Structures are given as structure tokens and as C-alpha cells.
Design a binder for this molecule. Structure first.
Ligand SMILES: CC(=O)Nc1ccc(NC(C)=O)cc1
Length: 95
């Protein structure tokens, strides 16, 4: 029986600019799961300290490559659906 659709892994290849961003915080591969992309995005925001010091869910990125990739000047980590849309524009899914 096929793995339930909801359970199937989401395998992705970051487009060149997102891949450059992930490699800047240690990623060394071309292909990832969505979980791994999310891990590296967290590492990148943490390392560059793009988050608001007091309201740490809020990320400022108008003067960052992340803003050009996501197409927003800032966002909240709590915006789960929007963050997915922003990430997917920078990924090719691997069948
Ligand atoms: C470092 C870390 O915690 N990453 C992370 C968190 C939740 C999940 N869950 C599932 C079920 O994918 C996977 C990875």
C-alpha cells in the first residue's frame, strides 16, 4: 500500500539563490527534505540576528537576500502558511 499522501516526504532542490543562502550556514548538498530547509533557514536568521531582539518571532529582511527570496520586508515565524508559500517559490520539488 502506498504511503499516505500526507506522510510522504517532501524532497526539494533549492534554486540557486536559496541554495547560496543555505550554504552560507553550512549546507553542503543540492537536495533536501523540507525539514532540512527549515532547519537551515532558522540557522541563517539566528546567525545574522535578523530577528527583533524583544519580539523574537519577528524577522526583518528588507536589506537581506532573504527578503528578495521571500518577497517581503519582514515576517513573523508564526505565519506558517505564508512562509511555506515563500519557501516554495525558491524550490523545485523532486519526484
Ligand atoms: C531540530 C528540530 O527540532 N527539527 C524538527 C522539528 C520537528 C520535526 N518534526 C517532524 C515530524 O518532521 C522535525 C524536525
Amino acid at each position: 500500500s502506498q504511503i499516505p499522501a500526507s506522510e510522504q516526504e517532501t524532497l526539494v532542490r533549492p534554486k540557486p539563490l536559496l541554495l547560496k543562502l543555505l550554504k552560507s550556514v553550512g549546507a553542503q548538498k543540492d537536495t533536501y527534505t523540507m525539514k532540512e530547509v527549515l532547519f537551515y533557514l532558522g540557522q541563517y536568521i539566528m546567525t545574522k540576528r535578523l530577528y527583533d531582539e524583544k519580539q523574537q518571532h519577528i524577522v526583518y529582511c528588507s536589506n537581506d537576500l532573504l527578503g528578495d527570496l521571500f518577497g517581503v520586508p519582514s515576517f513573523s515565524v508564526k505565519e506558517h502558511r505564508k512562509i511555506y508559500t515563500m519557501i516554495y517559490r525558491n524550490l523545485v520539488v523532486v519526484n
